[PDB]
Nucleic acid binder design. Sequence first.
DNA 1: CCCCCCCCCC
DNA 2: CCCCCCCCC
Lengths: 178, 184, 184, 184, 184, 184, 184, 184, 184, 184, 184
Amino acid sequence: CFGQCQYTAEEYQAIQKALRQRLGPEYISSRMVCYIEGHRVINLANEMFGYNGWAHSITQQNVDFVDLNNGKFYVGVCAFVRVQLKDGSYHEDVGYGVSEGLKSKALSLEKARKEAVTDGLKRALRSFGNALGNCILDKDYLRSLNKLPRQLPLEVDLTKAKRQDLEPSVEEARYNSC
Amino acid sequence: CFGQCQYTAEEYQAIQKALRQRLGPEYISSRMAGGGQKVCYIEGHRVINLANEMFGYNGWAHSITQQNVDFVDLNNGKFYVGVCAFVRVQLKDGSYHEDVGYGVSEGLKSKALSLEKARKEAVTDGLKRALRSFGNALGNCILDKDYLRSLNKLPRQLPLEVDLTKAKRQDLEPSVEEARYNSC
Amino acid sequence: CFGQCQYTAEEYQAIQKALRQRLGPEYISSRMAGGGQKVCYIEGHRVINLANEMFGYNGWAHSITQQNVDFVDLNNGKFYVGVCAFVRVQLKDGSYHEDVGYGVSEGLKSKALSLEKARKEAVTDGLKRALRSFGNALGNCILDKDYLRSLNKLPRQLPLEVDLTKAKRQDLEPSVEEARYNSC
Amino acid sequence: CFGQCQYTAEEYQAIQKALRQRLGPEYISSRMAGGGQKVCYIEGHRVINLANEMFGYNGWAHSITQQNVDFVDLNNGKFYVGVCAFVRVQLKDGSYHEDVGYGVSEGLKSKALSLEKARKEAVTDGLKRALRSFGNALGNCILDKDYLRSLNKLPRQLPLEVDLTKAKRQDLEPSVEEARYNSC
Amino acid sequence: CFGQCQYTAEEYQAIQKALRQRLGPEYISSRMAGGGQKVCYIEGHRVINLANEMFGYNGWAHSITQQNVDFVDLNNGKFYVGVCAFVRVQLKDGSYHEDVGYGVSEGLKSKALSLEKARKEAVTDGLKRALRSFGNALGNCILDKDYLRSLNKLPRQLPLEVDLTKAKRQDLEPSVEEARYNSC
Amino acid sequence: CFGQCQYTAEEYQAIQKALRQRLGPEYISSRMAGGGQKVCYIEGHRVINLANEMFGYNGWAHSITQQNVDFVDLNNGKFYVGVCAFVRVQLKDGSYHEDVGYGVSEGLKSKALSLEKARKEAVTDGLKRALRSFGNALGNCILDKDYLRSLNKLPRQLPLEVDLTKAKRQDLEPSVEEARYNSC
Amino acid sequence: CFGQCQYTAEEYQAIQKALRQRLGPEYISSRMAGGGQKVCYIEGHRVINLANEMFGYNGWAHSITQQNVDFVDLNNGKFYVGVCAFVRVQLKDGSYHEDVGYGVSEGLKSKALSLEKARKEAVTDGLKRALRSFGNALGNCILDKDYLRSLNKLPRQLPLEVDLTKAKRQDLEPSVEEARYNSC
Amino acid sequence: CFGQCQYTAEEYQAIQKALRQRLGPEYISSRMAGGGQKVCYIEGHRVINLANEMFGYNGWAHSITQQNVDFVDLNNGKFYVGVCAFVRVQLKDGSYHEDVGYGVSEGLKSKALSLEKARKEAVTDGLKRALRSFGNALGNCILDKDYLRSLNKLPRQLPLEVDLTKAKRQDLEPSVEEARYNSC
Amino acid sequence: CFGQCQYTAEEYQAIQKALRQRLGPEYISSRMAGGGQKVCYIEGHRVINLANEMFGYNGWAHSITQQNVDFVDLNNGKFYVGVCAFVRVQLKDGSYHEDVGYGVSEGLKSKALSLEKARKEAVTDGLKRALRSFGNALGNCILDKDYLRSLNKLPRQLPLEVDLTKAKRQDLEPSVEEARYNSC
Amino acid sequence: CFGQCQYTAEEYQAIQKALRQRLGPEYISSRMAGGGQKVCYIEGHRVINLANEMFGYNGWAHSITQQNVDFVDLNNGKFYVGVCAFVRVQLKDGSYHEDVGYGVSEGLKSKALSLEKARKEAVTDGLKRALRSFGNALGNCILDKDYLRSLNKLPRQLPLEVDLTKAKRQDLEPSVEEARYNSC
Amino acid sequence: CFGQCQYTAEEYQAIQKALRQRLGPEYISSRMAGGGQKVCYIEGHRVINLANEMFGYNGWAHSITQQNVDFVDLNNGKFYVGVCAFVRVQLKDGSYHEDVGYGVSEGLKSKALSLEKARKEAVTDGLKRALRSFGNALGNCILDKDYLRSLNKLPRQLPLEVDLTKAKRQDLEPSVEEARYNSC
DNA sequence: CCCCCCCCCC
DNA sequence: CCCCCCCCC
């Protein structure tokens, strides 16, 4: 099962080679600072290891503070996320979540907690190689990214989008799996 | 049993391909936020049915690791409640994803309904955010702004109608009863 | 034993198909839920019988992970009580779904009746919300507003009558007793 | 041993069939509730014997997960006590159902007797509500509003008589001792 | 060992039949309750002997899960003590039943004797109520009001006399010592 | 080892029969209660010897689950102490019986003697009450009022004399040493 | 190893026979209680050697489950200390007996010496009372008043003399060392 | 699985030799301390990639045993935060090294960013110091003063340029998917 | 390994015989207690060597279950410390003996030395009292007053001198290294 | 895996011989203590490399059992911090050594840097002292005063130069990667 | 592995013989202890080397069960610190010895140095006293007063000189690496 | 009510 | 939107 599977030579070789790849400009985004968006990291991990080849859990989440300054809330929240592969290999790291200025205590806490968990997951997956987000920390890679042409955001083709719940091929394979 | 079943090549490959699909406009809904901005989301029951179809009714599981009420404040007769929950989804092979949901209830005068609303919302949100990590088909694509742009350019479709003619009308499931009798 | 048996292909397919079924109007009832509007729901005993038919009396299980009384407040002689419960349903293959229920009692003068109402409602609500996660047939469809529109357009049927002629009248079960004697 | 035995096809089907039965009027009793209304219920010993017949003396089990005294109040010499209990019933195959019972005692001048009544009543109620989840035959049908009306239309029968001629009069059980000696 | 032995068909059926037996008048005793009314009961030693005969000296077991002193109050020189106990009986196959006993001592001037009486009574009562759940032969029939009337209609027999001629008079048990020597 | 050995048919039946025996007058002792009534009991060493002969020196065991000093009060220079103990007896097949003992010391001026008396008495009483549950031969019959009447009508026998001619006089046990040397 | 070895028939019967023996006057010692009455007891080392001979140096074991200092009081320069200990003896077959010992120290000016005396006495007394439960040969007979009377009528023998001619004078044990070298 | 793999002779020897290598100037960075002096270090991503190449992406793992915030102080509008972390790295053969990292933030006006900086720095520092213990190739050589001197004498090379032509541009990994499909 | 080995017949009997031996005057020492009385004891190292020869350096073991400082008092400039320790000796067959030692230091002005003395003495005393329980050869006879009288009648011998000519002078143990190399 | 491997004769003998070697002056360093004196020590990275060469990168491991900050004092604006750490080193055969390290930081005005220095120094010192216990080669000889005098009499060598020509300049390890590919 | 290996006859006998050896004057040193006179002791590194030679680098292990700082007191600028530690030594066969060490620092002005001295001394002292229990060769004889007298009569030899010609000069151990390479 | 407990016991 | 008044008395 999970945590018991040992990587075969072919799969080990494919993943080890693939994880060295640096990410193209399609993955990187910027704010006012470069970063990779959460769903992109999720999709990267799902493609690298399979939907059932990686796992993550929240070891502990701790609210550092909730302060009130003339009607505005300032909240800091840390989270400890541990990623595990289907072979037992694991990486655990710290994420943080901040919410300053909001008037809603509850919305501030929601933003801070969710942000902390997502950040922790990104930083835990980072430790597997450049393909999962390590290259973003290399300043030479950032410069080589700035010299690249700023391409416009690609468009998504919703023609083959999932339109009904049923997955007939999946149901067939699962019925044949028993 | 559960957590021990190992995925066969056919089911693994089918699921891996199927999870890449982004969701059509049938799944996505929208509300208005505190900044007057549009926020998309998938309704709970849609995600539950999506997961039941992707993994089988017995191929996925979820549990509440911890639910914690952050605060209960009383402002001139109105209750403001924040509740977080940690939901862990597991597949029949032991693979798991755990995330946090939050639940908010501001303005209500009934403390009990505020707490109920916050707790249930927190748990459902945590389940959705935990299931997100399995792929676009279970809700990962909703975070892609390009997917959102491609969704607005689409015609606002009218609510589909449900045909309740073959709806279940009595408890017994005879084919199910036979299949189970033959299992003992 | 329980939690160890793996579903056979025939029973898996039967149950997966049956769980997709939406519920007819015989199951749906209405009360005034949280929010003060008319809200549809499935009665507890109906969900119990639904689950017993879907999985068998020994094919599903549930337990109360934790029940916590959030508060008991007294406002000029009336009691206001909120109670949450965490109920986890498990199938005979180890598959599980856990959710939160809440129980409310505001205004009553009897503390004991208020607490009893809140605790029992919390447990039953948690069980229903945990069973929701297996498919439409166990209560997931009730959350689809399109399903509600398709339910209102249906002819309002009168409550069916129960024929108590073949009702159980003595304790002994000879058919069961024989199979059990031969099972040892 | 217990929790390990798997139900055989014959015993499973027999029990699944028997549990669908609604109960005849011999089981149901009634009192006058709060608002000058009628409320039906099944007495504890009836449910105990029903379970012993359905599963065998060694085919079902129950335990008290937790009992918590909610309150003990003193108003001018009278004690008012509320007690909840969490009872978990388990079958010989590991299947389980857990629910909450409550126990109330208002008016008594003895704190000890109030607590005794409340605790025992809570536990018995919890056992009844836990056994309810196995099917109609163990008490689920009592929740059906149509079933109660269909029960009122039957002629109210007078208490059947019990013939104590074959009552056990001395301790020794020779057939049991013989089979048990043959068990070694 | 204990909790592992599985009941053989003959012993299962013998015990299942024997537990249906209602108890004769030799077992029932009576005291007066608070409202000056008759309350029936089975004495502790009677239940112990019944259980030893039904299952064997090594076929049933009981343990005190938890005992909690609810209160010890002093009212003008008299002590009033209430004590609850949770007793769990288990059979040699792992089957179990757990229930609550209570112990009361009101009026005594000695705290120590009040506590002793309350604790011991709680434990014994809990054992009786746990054994009750196996069937009429172990004490369930005492709860049937119809069974009680048929007991009043019976002639109250004078206390049976005990023939102490075959009483054990010295420690050695040669047949037992021999059977055990042959076990090594 | 202990707790695993399963009783052989011969030893089971021998012990089951022997435990039914009531005790002769050699075992019973008496003290006086204040109301002019007589209270019977079996002395500690007598119960220990009874158990050693019934089960063997290595066929029964007991342990102190918990001992709790309820109170130690000082009233005008005199100490009044109540102590409870929970003793669990276990047989070599895993069968067990657990009960409560109490120990009392009122009036003594030495706190140390009060505590020692109460603790030791509690433990011994708990052992007696736990062993009682195995049958009449180990002390259950002492609670039967008819057995008490049949005991009082018997001629008061003079204290038996002990023949110390074959008493153990030196440490070495040669037969035991030889049997154990062959056991390695 | 220890706790797993099962007693062989020869050793079981030999030990069972030997444990029935009462002790001669060589073992019994006496002091005067605080009320001028005669109190018998067995010295610690005598009981230790008794157990070593009955079961072997490696056939019995004991451990201190818990030691609790009940009180340490200071009255005009003198310390009064009560300490209880719970000692559990176990045989190589898993059989066990647990009892309580007490240790007292009144009058001493040194708190440390008082505590040392009380703790050591509590533990030794607990070991004696735990070993008592194995039979008369290990100290059970000391509680029989008839044995005490038969002890008084026996001639009080003068303290035996110890022959230190065959005493161990150097550390080395050549026979033991040889038997052990052949054991590897 | 992980923690079970034993290093093969070829892989052990390869890694043992490779870890002896000291690092070239491409890895080392430097800053100025609070007292105007040069401090060398290895950046986090370099250590992560070094370890991934030395042991494989699945041949090393690390976990946070505990993170403890030492202090958060507010001095006239500036926050000073010290946080320690204990990081444990493990290899696929069970070999492990655990060390401490620290995180500092002095002067900042935002508490949230101070805490984020201190916690993340503590964890990364602990990871670097834990990996340091495996050899020079993973960072031990940075502590050799002679290695630092021999590094300064080297020509300061210009920052290398990165060729992003072969960068990953889409999610799909066909070779990886193929090998994994062949792994089921 | 340790705790698992079962004693072979030869070594068992050798040790069983050897443990009966009383100790010659070379082992016994004496001090003067507070009442000017002669108190006998065996020095620690002698008991350690006794055990090392009786069971082998690897045939017995001891551990400190708990050490508890009873008090540390400061009375007019001097420290008075009492410390108890619970030492459990175990043999290579799993047999064990646990007892309490005490350590005292009264009068010293340095707290640190008082604590050191009390703790170390408590541990050593506990080890001596635990080893005593195996038989006379390890110190049980020292408690026999008859043994003490038989010790006084012997001539007080002068301290034996130790021959340090064949003393160990370098670390290496060549025969040991050879035997160990041949064990791998 | 780790903790399971048994040392082969060749590797055992090699390591046992190698650990006796004392360290040359290349390893030893010196500082000035509080009395203007010479204190010798081995720098951390040297000890890490020593252990990695003696046992292999995967043949030794260490963990931090506990680190405890003893004190943080503020004396006229400067911080003085003492921190202890407990480091446990384990070999691939399960052999282990645990010792204490300390860390000090006096004079700094930054609390965070003081704590960082003290914690890191404590952990490194504990690792050095734990590895010391394996033999002279890992640092035990540094405690021999004769070793120190014989160290002064040797010619003080110039700091060796480091040859960075073959330093690792890129991440990939082709020999390691190939040896690992052949291991799956 | 460690804790599982059983000693072979040859190695057991060699080690048992070697442990009897008393130590020559090369090992013994003298300082001013808590008795206020010339007190003999074995230096830490000597005991470590003794153990490494007696059992092998991988044949003995020790751990710190607990270290507890008893007190830190400040008297006119000087610190008085007492620290105890519990060290447990174990051999490769599971045999173990656990004892207490103490560490003292009185008079020093630096709190950090006092705590460091006390903790390290406590751990080292505990290790020495735990190793004492294995025989004279590891330090038991140092307590023998006759051994001390026989040590004074020996010629006081001058500090031995160490031959550092074959001192270890580089990290690599080629023979060790070869023996390990062939072990995989 | 009473008995348990008060007075006695150490 | 609930909460209040209703319901339990």
